[PDB]
Structure formats: C-alpha cells, structure tokens
Design a protein around this ligand. Structure first.
Ligand SMILES: CCC[C@@H](NC(=O)c1ccc2oc(=O)[nH]c2c1)[C@@H](O)c1ccccc1C
Length: 352
C-alpha cells in the first residue's frame, strides 16, 4: 500500500531536515523531499558513472540493493499520482531546466525529461545574465499563476545550466478565526490567526517523542502530521523521528475529544540546492568534472545553479485536553496513495 521508493524518500527527508536543523535552530524549515528528489532523479538521466551514482546515493538509494529501473519507475508512478486532476486542483509542481544556447543537446535526454518526468527544458542566452534570470523567473511565475515571484536573485557569469524546482500547495481541510500569542522563544511573541475548535480529532500524546501528535486531512489526498513537543523536548523529538514511527501514526484512525488552537499559517522555503545537496554528498554534478554526456556529448557542462522553492497557502464530562499549537512545531505532509513525504518542516517563527 505504498510506492517502492517511499522509504528512500522518507530517509532523504530526514537527512535533508537534520542537516538544516543542525545548521540553525531559530530558522523555519520548509521543503519538499518529493519534488527535490524527483528533480535530481530526472537530472541523473543525463549523467553517467560517479556523477550519476553520487546523485542517486545522495537521495538515499542504495545502488547495490535497488535496481535503477525500479527508482525511475517509482518516480514515474509518484508523478502519475500527483498529476491526477483532483491532486492538480490543490498541488502544482514543476521543474525547469535552462541550458545555454549553442550547446548541442542530446535528443534522448530532452524526450525522457518530458515523457517520464513531465518537466520542461529550455534554451536560454546566458550571455545576458539579467535577461536569463528574468526568463527563468517568468517561467516559474507563469507556472504558479503569479504565486512565486523572482525565485532566482543572482546568476553567476559562468552559468551555462540552471535547474529550478518549485512546488505550490493550496491547503484546504477535507471536511471564524481570532488572533493569538505564538511563543517563538522565551523572549519572543508574535500574533497569529488561530482557529479554535472542540471536536473529535486524530490526536495523541506520544511518550517516545515527548510530543502531542495531530493528524489532519486536506483536499488533494494529503495528510499532515503535526508534532508539538513538550517543554525543552523539540530536539529530542527531531532526534527520535523515524519512518516506522510515522507509519504507525498514519495507520492510527482512532479519534478523541480535544479543544485545539490551530494557527492558520501559510509557509514558504527557498533553498540553494548546490549548497544543501553538497553537504549530503551530491557534488560532482556541480563541479568541472561533471559527467553530463547524457545532456550534451561534445562540450563540457556542469550544473551551475539549482534552486528549490516550496509554498503552502491555506484557502464526556471531564474537561477535554486543550492543545494549543502556539510554539515551534515539526510537521510532515504525506500523499495518501503513495505514503510519500510531500513536505517536511518546522514552524519556529510564523512571521519569518
Ligand atoms: C498546526 C496547524 C497548521 C496548519 N493549519 C491549518 O491547516 C489551518 C488552521 C486554521 C484554519 O482555519 C481555517 O478555516 N482553516 C484552517 C487551517 C497549516 O498552517 C500548516 C502548517 C505547516 C505545514 C502544513 C500546514 C497545512
């Protein structure tokens, strides 16, 4: 009842999250393990040898155990699922490959990119750095009907190849707000629109994670899992999270009475993938020794720029437990058919 690559995508999600969280603790985290991995698995089609193996190993695929055909077939099925009209009403995903004009491109790569990964490849004049950046940004804008604006802020002069990966999700629950205090830290407090409700929720307190665990369903076949840590236990929560633990919560359908304070938050994350994935061991494709002969046979080529942007916008006689999501919390968003991790992150400052 899951896609073959879902455990690998879950391991990739934890690796990417833990890297970002180890760097800074006062920063929001918001990315799509699915869209980033789809993009680099699509890119691997134009790569060979160590450049190739490094990308797939960097996405947590063990090439001695998983045949490469099962990886691409896994990604194609996941894309097939996400591109269903009901999911398309809530979720927009895209990859744009921008290659220098004057490069002789391999027809097989351009066809496989389109047929297997529903991505777009474009010819751009990197000789005009400012116009190159505008054509890339206008493609993302047109793709997200104006939601993502000026994604790329700076391009290197040597840029010959840019990768842009974006995902936009409109959050609307499957089935009258008021402002309230959000305790970012002990000396910081912001105000957020909070939905107050008493109802039967899929919520539980976990002793292993020392957190309240809330599951909620959204249109587009998506389930969000919110982890609200106990005082001083956010790091313990981040450390103890595993794919098996998350699968067991997703399996739980038991509800209880609870009074919840839920913040109506929209969230965004922007990442320099050359930097982030470099720390995960994906370096060859961004260096002069890159084997991109599947993209262009004659000329040297390296991936100069790779950017990710993720956007989420919201469209018993005993006194029941009162759970307020009014302080930093971790979350995952799963696609229901595949169990794939669509999003992963942490809200620490809702105004950041
Ligand atoms: C902890 C929950 C965060 C979450 N909130 C909601 O879905 C949400 C709240 C209030 C609402 O009032 C409405 O009328 N509709 C609403 C929806 C949402 O902001 C979020 C945060 C981080 C990751 C994913 C999501 C969906």
């Amino acid at each position: 009842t899951f896609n073959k690559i879902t455990p690998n995508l879950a391991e990739f999600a934890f690796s990417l999250y833990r890297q970002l969280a180890h760097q800074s603790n006062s920063t929001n985290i918001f990315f799509s393990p699915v869209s980033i991995a789809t993009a680099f698995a699509m890119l691997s089609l134009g790569t060979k040898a160590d450049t190739h193996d490094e990308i797939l190993e960097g996405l947590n695929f063990n090439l001695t155990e998983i045949p490469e055909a099962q990886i691409h077939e896994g990604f194609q099925e996941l894309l097939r699922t996400l591109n269903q009209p009901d999911s398309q009403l809530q979720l927009t995903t895209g990859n744009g490959l921008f290659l220098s004009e004057g490069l002789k491109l391999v027809d097989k790569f351009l066809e496989d990119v389109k047929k297997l990964y529903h991505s777009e490849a474009f010819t751009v004049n990197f000789g005009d750095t400012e116009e190159a950046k505008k054509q890339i940004n206008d493609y993302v804008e047109k793709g997200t009907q104006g939601k993502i604006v000026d994604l790329v802020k700076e391009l290197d002069r040597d840029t010959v190849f840019a990768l842009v990966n974006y995902i936009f999700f409109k959050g609307k629950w499957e089935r009258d707000t008021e402002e309230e205090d959000f305790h970012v830290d002990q000396v910081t407090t912001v105000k957020v629109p909070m939905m107050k409700r008493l109802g039967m929720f899929n919520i539980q307190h976990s002793k292993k994670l020392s957190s309240w665990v809330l599951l909620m369903k959204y249109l587009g076949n998506a389930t969000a899992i919110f982890f609200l840590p106990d005082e001083g236990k956010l790091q313990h929560l981040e450390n103890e999270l595993t794919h098996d633990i998350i699968t067991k919560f997703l399996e739980n359908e038991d509800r209880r009475s609870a009074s919840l304070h839920l913040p109506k938050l929209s969230i965004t994350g922007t990442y320099d993938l050359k930097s982030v994935l470099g720390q995960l061991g994906i370096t060859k494709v961004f260096s002069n020794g890159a084997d991109l002969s599947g993209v262009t046979e004659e000329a040297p080529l390296k991936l100069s720029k790779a950017v990710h942007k993720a956007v989420l916008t919201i469209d018993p006689m005993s006194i029941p437990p009162e759970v307020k999501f009014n302080k930093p919390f971790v979350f995952l968003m799963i696609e229901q058919n595949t169990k794939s991790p669509l999003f992963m992150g942490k809200v620490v400052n809702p105004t950041q």
